[PDB]
DNA sequence: AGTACTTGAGCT
RNA sequence: GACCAGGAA
DNA sequence: AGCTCAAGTACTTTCCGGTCA
């Protein structure tokens, strides 16, 4: 998981920036546009690596307006979860339906029904919890989940998880 | 080759009979164009316009719909190297002024 | 303007022509396309979920599109589809369809010949797609049987098998929109002796084309991805959206639908007759009645000027306007809408010549100077001069018409309450008037020369004629016996550059047409320059002094 | 190279490509009476070696598609015994440059 | 895929069209309040500013010349001769 | 006024490429469409505002480009599609030469 | 038809002339690489004349008391007499001009001497004279080497193609062949010193101007000669009115590549 | 406009099939083992176990702040506070995913110290296991190789219960403390 | 407006 | 707006 | 019946009053 990935990004620049702080404003606009981005294709583009060697290349003057398009070649750390991947995470929310678990940038939600049967919902607890013969699961606790499937919304991926199978659960 | 020769010769004579002078290069080009193919290629609907230039291009002279119909049925792929294609597409053509690209050089932009 | 889109802006690199597989048409379709009625939710003015917009494009000009949400200027069309009750020939490929049947076995779908014949394997190797199809066709048209066993290519005593099927191949002739066959037969090995005579149905030809092998059809002009032969036959009919066939709606209580909307209506109707006719008690000929009829409309919708007689005509007599007809040029989409256009920022009027203009300028009537605009960007260089013109106004001469704010929104100095207290900001645009020494394109048609359109310096002047230097008269072919001339005005900094640097009158003087100058001294000035320079001709001091001063360069000596 | 008076029967005509790699050319005697290559209008054609050709193509960055073409049956092509793919270099006099290089490839 | 500068073969002079596009492009850019690399010595017309940038070879642009085959030579407007 | 076929030639003669485009686009017809990067047609339902795109049936919610062509061509292409011919439009090449 | 048939032809950045298919039409544009505008009729002296007076005009014999440059012509005159080594130079110089004379007579069979070439040399030398107030008396300060090798050099600077390889290099030679003839015929030693009467500095200038003007005279990659050529032929076809069919309908006949022409005719 | 890669794949019309991603080690196209860097040369897939990851972002974010000052001239919970400031100096703040991440990474790393990670990296990258597995093994703490091969099903026959149980033991040694 | 190609049909 | 018809440098 | 042709077809510029849903 948690890959480093070679990527590129076309960026147009208004002529008014064709001054010597050019590569400067470029590398920036890259980090604006790309860093913190999340795409289905590559996942969460987390941190742009190696600022000092970003590839500016030569930029082409577009022909009707005078802006110049650069393909900025770069590389960065990304995070793209998968089905069947096992993740360690922290509980964030908890409800009569299940619990959400924070795994880096993304949340994995575990259904009431994707747990063991004995683990059950305690509405009357602060903060609201899931209790077992021997386990307690609530907002601060740490969980180990099997990612059962992922869904890619706009600037996020969410995913449904399970702790029913072996060696998964509280830790 | 000798065909080309005679071909020019006769074309030159049409122009020069009327008295006018046209520079060699222009007649040469036309004449050369008819010729390079392998023999005499008519400057007509079913002559030059049947070569393997762009579908869209050829379609802009004489056989328009008939051409595009064929273009689809044989899955022609238009290069878009032609003038006319770009004219149809609203793109600047590779024509004079468009025959080449223009880049900023960040380097020299900092040197000055 | 037209609105901002986050989508990446590119240029077309390749155009890849192909054929619609039905599946694709069903797939792009934002609606079928079920009812011949245009709209009128039963008389109630508003579109019917059935023809134009059951999600398609939009009418109304208020009231935005119901798929994208965007309204006329922005929303292109959106395609619909009608499911055809029976397969039908695309009129354009009846041609090719026939020739393919002539090439392949009309029963099994094997190519009639292969690498077992030699001329065949030689045509097969022809690099050019189109040419090879022709080379193949002439070979295969003769072969009148799907042969099972072939003399091998080592010795013709032991006959190697190729593909199955014995079946004789029909001889095929077109009977306008119908393809009909004629099989040799046998009967005591005679025949014919009156051969078998039936008509090839779409559906069968279709099935044969389907069975045609990927490698086989690929040897014919085709492409397994972008155009399979089966797709020369129509089962799913893409329905173009209103912007292609817009209802030109005079006043309000009167539609005025487009010719195509009608032809589709017909197709729709013709399709419903056929559909219910077979789903019901099918009198098996009244079926092939409506079959033919559908095939006809779907034919004449694409092409109505067909060789085989009748011309699908509007009630009135006026024949219907086929899509084909819209395209065949000199007027007509390709030639007259694309290779040429009517254009903005242009003007024309009577010309007359001027002995007092300089060669490369053109006298522009103040009236036109005041109409014609140049989009100038607010900049520190021009900011005051620009503000001056704006305050100056649009009815005044050297003035301006519109101010365009950063927010892409347009200010009309003709009306805008703030047309006085209008305060320019760097980066806005003032569309100002055409002013002295703006480079412009002057052009006298017909335009057979480079030199027939040349860049000139503007000189705004009175009276209503374009005035031009007498010596530039000849490369335009112009005489003042009433001939008008067009003037176009560039809008970009880039384009004026192009004009002044490439096609300015002075540049065009010596010309590659004939390696000589293409304009010179003419008329009065010529007639006079002779008289002037005789030996006889002398000039007194009084006059000489004027003649000298008149030369605008003169060292004053 | 068979030089025949009147005709060669289509029977015999079949035996012509029948012994590769050897190539066989038929020429009508009556044609060969005047040498067309000596005509005023008929400039120097020169057969290029494979090596020679590869270089032409390289130095002009060309696919064979892009080269001007001589038909295989072309009178001069026949004289030189051009086989398809072979390229000839044509040297002509120029009223513009004096001498001029040109190439045609065989169809 | 671009030819190395030491193997360039095109004219080392600048072509009518190259120049017209260079002048036009800069003038556009100047018009759009881009940085000017010259003393506008009372200049105010983006073309004339550009004609002046060109006259002093301080235009930070590059012509990319394409060959029929697709390859190319990049030339600095610095290094192009302007006897044009 | 008509910037006709011949007026075109004359500019091509001049090699005045941009001015040609200006006259053919900004001085007239010019228009913007969104196209799919898979199938090459104007299919895309650009809800450009909620910033959503999609060429359903290509299922492509992601690979979308915008282009500036003359409406007449936009028409011409719809007209061809209407007549079962697909003039697919592509923003990258493959062939070279 | 003409325009539509040639529209996509243009000169590319390698001087090649191609269409949208990148097929070669001319290898060098107009067989000569020159832009049509930069060209004027110009008389190739060398081609005509009696062999008698050709010689009188061009031959220098430093080995012969009557055919030397009289020392009035240049300062070296008195000491140049009998100089064998120099004579080898003039002997190339002359042997070349003669070569050229035969060559030109192979090209222009009729003897026609005027032909449109780039760089009007006549005017250049005129300017040289009026620019440098050349004294149609006092002797030049040129050497035989100055003149002979100056021209030999200037020739190598008339560039039309550029590549570093034999095909391209040869192509360049071809392209330049005719102009070079013109050049050598106008700048032969005797001619320079006796007729034009140039001083060293004048000649130097004349050479430099020639080179420049020549360089000016090549076509600019991008030039759309397709439409240019068509238009250049079609437009004069607009101003149009043994008896062989001629004018407009013969032109029609030709472009059509008509099988059945009106006035077929052999000319034996 | 958005982000592209180096996988030049030209999907001409043929939409589908989009093979599902599982740890049957069928990750994306964008993540097969044969990758290609901007020298065009084929390079192998890069995966990080957190810590290997934490150290990459930390490092890059650091040498980024170094440039932010250059150009301007003319205990885990205790690292959390440290890191939180580094984001405030190099990160555009809106990027709350990085902050969310550096939290998690800081609190879930198995190897706090540089060398220690290199040691892990050595140990695993020698099993020839697919980079994904090699990552997950550095990321997920395990004992019974039953445990291991259950959470990382993709392993299985790839390496013996014993060998993998050896490795696993070595990992728990390097398991840096807090 | 005359030539193009291509269709068509009639005759031996 | 189709379409038809007539008349101009 | 097929196969030859002559005789059949459609197709090859810029401006500025009527009838048709
Ligand atoms: Mg007139
Ligand atoms: Zn819509
Ligand atoms: Zn069969
Ligand atoms: Zn699509």
GROMACS .gro file of C-alpha atoms in nm, chain E:
model
   84
  948UNK     CA    1   1.197   1.353  -3.066
  949UNK     CA    2   1.412   1.663  -3.112
  950UNK     CA    3   1.746   1.715  -3.272
  951UNK     CA    4   2.053   1.802  -3.059
  952UNK     CA    5   2.166   2.164  -3.100
  953UNK     CA    6   2.500   2.060  -3.250
  954UNK     CA    7   2.327   1.884  -3.540
  955UNK     CA    8   2.082   2.145  -3.645
  956UNK     CA    9   2.037   2.189  -4.020
  957UNK     CA   10   1.773   2.455  -4.084
  958UNK     CA   11   1.841   2.820  -4.174
  959UNK     CA   12   2.015   3.006  -3.896
  960UNK     CA   13   1.822   3.308  -4.018
  961UNK     CA   14   1.471   3.385  -3.896
  962UNK     CA   15   1.182   3.346  -4.147
  963UNK     CA   16   0.919   3.610  -4.229
  964UNK     CA   17   0.664   3.398  -4.052
  965UNK     CA   18   0.876   3.324  -3.749
  966UNK     CA   19   0.935   3.693  -3.700
  967UNK     CA   20   0.573   3.791  -3.756
  968UNK     CA   21   0.469   3.531  -3.504
  969UNK     CA   22   0.741   3.632  -3.262
  970UNK     CA   23   0.649   3.998  -3.284
  971UNK     CA   24   0.280   3.920  -3.268
  972UNK     CA   25   0.311   3.688  -2.972
  973UNK     CA   26   0.518   3.920  -2.757
  974UNK     CA   27   0.293   4.214  -2.840
  975UNK     CA   28  -0.004   4.005  -2.733
  976UNK     CA   29   0.169   3.910  -2.409
  977UNK     CA   30   0.282   4.269  -2.350
  978UNK     CA   31  -0.075   4.382  -2.413
  979UNK     CA   32  -0.173   4.140  -2.140
  980UNK     CA   33   0.056   4.317  -1.892
  981UNK     CA   34   0.336   4.063  -1.906
  982UNK     CA   35   0.687   4.171  -1.794
  983UNK     CA   36   0.876   4.377  -2.055
  984UNK     CA   37   1.251   4.310  -2.077
  985UNK     CA   38   1.358   4.641  -2.222
  986UNK     CA   39   1.340   5.010  -2.139
  987UNK     CA   40   1.018   5.127  -2.299
  988UNK     CA   41   1.175   5.453  -2.381
  989UNK     CA   42   0.840   5.623  -2.380
  990UNK     CA   43   0.695   5.335  -2.572
  991UNK     CA   44   0.334   5.235  -2.531
  992UNK     CA   45   0.239   5.028  -2.831
  993UNK     CA   46   0.290   4.659  -2.755
  994UNK     CA   47   0.404   4.593  -3.111
  995UNK     CA   48   0.663   4.866  -3.102
  996UNK     CA   49   0.765   4.745  -2.756
  997UNK     CA   50   0.802   4.401  -2.911
  998UNK     CA   51   0.978   4.526  -3.217
  999UNK     CA   52   1.214   4.687  -2.960
 1000UNK     CA   53   1.246   4.369  -2.752
 1001UNK     CA   54   1.335   4.190  -3.078
 1002UNK     CA   55   1.582   4.453  -3.183
 1003UNK     CA   56   1.773   4.391  -2.862
 1004UNK     CA   57   1.733   4.014  -2.873
 1005UNK     CA   58   1.572   4.017  -2.531
 1006UNK     CA   59   1.272   3.808  -2.623
 1007UNK     CA   60   1.269   3.496  -2.410
 1008UNK     CA   61   1.095   3.285  -2.671
 1009UNK     CA   62   1.191   2.978  -2.870
 1010UNK     CA   63   1.084   2.876  -3.217
 1011UNK     CA   64   1.037   2.505  -3.243
 1012UNK     CA   65   1.082   2.414  -3.604
 1013UNK     CA   66   0.913   2.098  -3.719
 1014UNK     CA   67   1.041   1.866  -3.986
 1015UNK     CA   68   0.796   1.680  -4.214
 1016UNK     CA   69   0.878   1.364  -4.021
 1017UNK     CA   70   0.782   1.510  -3.685
 1018UNK     CA   71   1.124   1.570  -3.535
 1019UNK     CA   72   1.236   1.921  -3.456
 1020UNK     CA   73   1.497   2.185  -3.393
 1021UNK     CA   74   1.451   2.444  -3.118
 1022UNK     CA   75   1.600   2.785  -3.193
 1023UNK     CA   76   1.629   3.077  -2.955
 1024UNK     CA   77   1.515   3.409  -3.097
 1025UNK     CA   78   1.840   3.519  -2.938
 1026UNK     CA   79   2.037   3.311  -3.189
 1027UNK     CA   80   1.833   3.369  -3.499
 1028UNK     CA   81   1.975   3.609  -3.757
 1029UNK     CA   82   1.732   3.887  -3.849
 1030UNK     CA   83   1.853   4.028  -4.188
 1031UNK     CA   84   1.489   3.950  -4.273
   0.00000   0.00000   0.00000
